[PDB]
């Protein structure tokens, strides 16, 4: 998972910057410390951390600076002493401080499991859609993020187009598009002379995508399907007990609206019964409100077929041994020692996770989204996790951390 070992000569270890060496940028300060100044260093399950590092190396291998440690990872036995020595000998620890503080926020995320099936059945009735046949993504230059312009669009590929005012084939009225400050692409479809915003969740729920999109699977509950959209990935568990792994492909770009807030406004349930268990039970006694409530959130996620979801590094994540970081501050792929408390037991949760993912809301020098794995338990823990953490970034000897604006 892995268990294996590649034989051969130890890779060059290189030359560690000495303790107290400092890099600063973007309000952050990185400082080399001894491996032993990290809380409970020696006691950790380094064998799991090494299996986690090995998963990232399929892509991390190819990044300058990382070739030797990634080859060395596969020549190290999956045992905690050897793994510990690998991290101690091949990497230098950089304590991270953001805005003058070593303290930051650790939150949690997971991959939900839902009952479903690969083909439609009496129970698995709700389709999970791949990217539609007519779904067109068009890059939006920073210049147009005021979203007022009437532009022309030209198709350039099956699911892609470009803004071309002189030779575009269709008109797009950007004011009609859900464009905000962070927007880097608009999603739409060609229709007569126009390029129109893509279907909202309500239109999709009401069957806009019929015969027009790949279906990857069917879920049994539309509320849990709805929440998988929120998580951005998931796994179907078939009646056989088999898994269908499903990953983020794209989205319609329509805003996120919170249905818990809507539900609280209509009086349907109060703003405290706001959970997928509360909504799911409520929708079981009141099926006539389903279409209405779900369609309040216009955002809609499209998926693709893929053990572990694939993060920003392009690599499958190990439960409890990976997290999402801000790439402005943390070098993607780096081991990250995180010191924090377990969300439930309050026992020290001190460990080397692999910084293998990113997230739109994950911002700051000391800021981790802790990946808990897949399933119900992982989702409970993930939802309860909002703890203070302290972080150290381990980098290959001689590689410096960097603020990347």
TrEMBL record:
InterPro entries registered for this protein in UniProt: 3D_dom, MltA, MltA_B, RlpA-like_sf
Highest taxon, organism lineage: Bacteria
Protein biosynthesis among keywords: no
GO BP: cell wall organization; peptidoglycan catabolic process; peptidoglycan turnover
Span of domain Lytic transglycosylase MltA: 113-304
SUPFAM superfamilies xref list: Barwin-like endoglucanases
GO molecular function: hydrolase activity, hydrolyzing O-glycosyl compounds; peptidoglycan lytic transglycosylase activity
Keywords from the named record: Cell wall biogenesis/degradation, Lyase, Signal
Keyword NAD: no
Top enzyme category: lyase
Disulfide bonds: 57-70
Gene Ontology cellular component annotations, sorted alphabetically: outer membrane
One matching Pfam family: 3D
Entry EC number(s): 4.2.2.n1
Catalytic activity line of the entry: Exolytic cleavage of the (1->4)-beta-glycosidic linkage between N-acetylmuramic acid (MurNAc) and N-acetylglucosamine (GlcNAc) residues in peptidoglycan, from either the reducing or the non-reducing ends of the peptidoglycan chains, with concomitant formation of a 1,6-anhydrobond in the MurNAc residue
PANTHER family: MEMBRANE-BOUND LYTIC MUREIN TRANSGLYCOSYLASE A (PTHR30124:SF0)
Protein name according to UniProt: peptidoglycan lytic exotransglycosylase
Organism of derivation: Neisseria gonorrhoeae (strain ATCC 700825 / FA 1090)
């Amino acid at each position: 998972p892995d268990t294996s070992v590649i034989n051969g000569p130890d890779r060059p270890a290189g030359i560690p910057d000495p303790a107290g060496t400092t890099v600063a940028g973007g309000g952050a300060v990185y400082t080399v410390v001894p491996h032993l100044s990290m809380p409970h260093w020696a006691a950790q399950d380094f064998a799991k951390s090494l299996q986690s590092f090995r998963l990232g190396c399929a892509n991390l291998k190819n990044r300058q600076g990382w070739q030797d440690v990634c080859a060395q990872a596969f020549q190290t036995p999956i045992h905690s002493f050897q793994a510990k020595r690998f991290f101690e000998r091949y990497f230098t620890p950089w304590q991270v401080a953001g805005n003058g503080s070593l303290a930051g926020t650790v939150t949690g995320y997971y991959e939900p499991v839902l009952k479903g099936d690969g083909r439609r059945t009496e129970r698995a009735r709700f389709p999970i859609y791949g990217i539609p046949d007519d779904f067109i993504s068009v890059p939006l230059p920073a210049g147009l993020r005021g979203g007022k312009n009437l532009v022309r669009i030209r198709q350039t590929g099956k699911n892609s187009g470009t803004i071309d005012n002189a030779g575009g084939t269709h008109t797009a009225d950007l004011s009609r598009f859900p464009i905000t400050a962070r927007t880097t692409a608009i999603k739409g479809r060609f229709e007569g002379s126009r390029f129109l915003p893509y279907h909202t969740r309500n239109q999709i729920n009401g069957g806009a995508l019929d015969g027009k999109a790949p279906i990857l699977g069917y879920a049994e509950d539309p509320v849990e399907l709805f929440f998988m959209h929120i998580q951005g990935s998931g796994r179907l568990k078939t009646p056989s007990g088999k898994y269908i792994r499903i990953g983020y492909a794209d989205k319609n770009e329509h805003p996120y609206v919170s249905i818990g807030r809507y539900m609280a406004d209509k009086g349907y349930l109060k703003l405290g019964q706001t959970s997928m268990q509360g909504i799911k039970a409520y929708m079981r006694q009141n099926p006539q409100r389903l279409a209405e409530v779900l369609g309040q959130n216009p955002s809609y996620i499209f998926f693709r077929e893929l053990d572990g979801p694939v993060g920003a590094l392009g690599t499958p994540l190990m439960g409890e041994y990976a997290g999402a970081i801000d790439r402005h501050y943390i070098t993607l792929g780096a081991p990250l020692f995180v010191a924090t408390a377990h969300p439930v037991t309050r026992k020290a949760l001190n460990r080397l996770i692999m910084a293998q993912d990113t997230g739109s809301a994950i911002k700051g020098a000391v800021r981790v989204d802790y990946f808990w794995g897949y399933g119900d338990e992982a989702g409970e823990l993930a939802g309860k996790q909002k703890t203070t953490g302290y972080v150290w970034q381990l980098l290959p000897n001689g590689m410096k951390p960097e603020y990347r604006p």
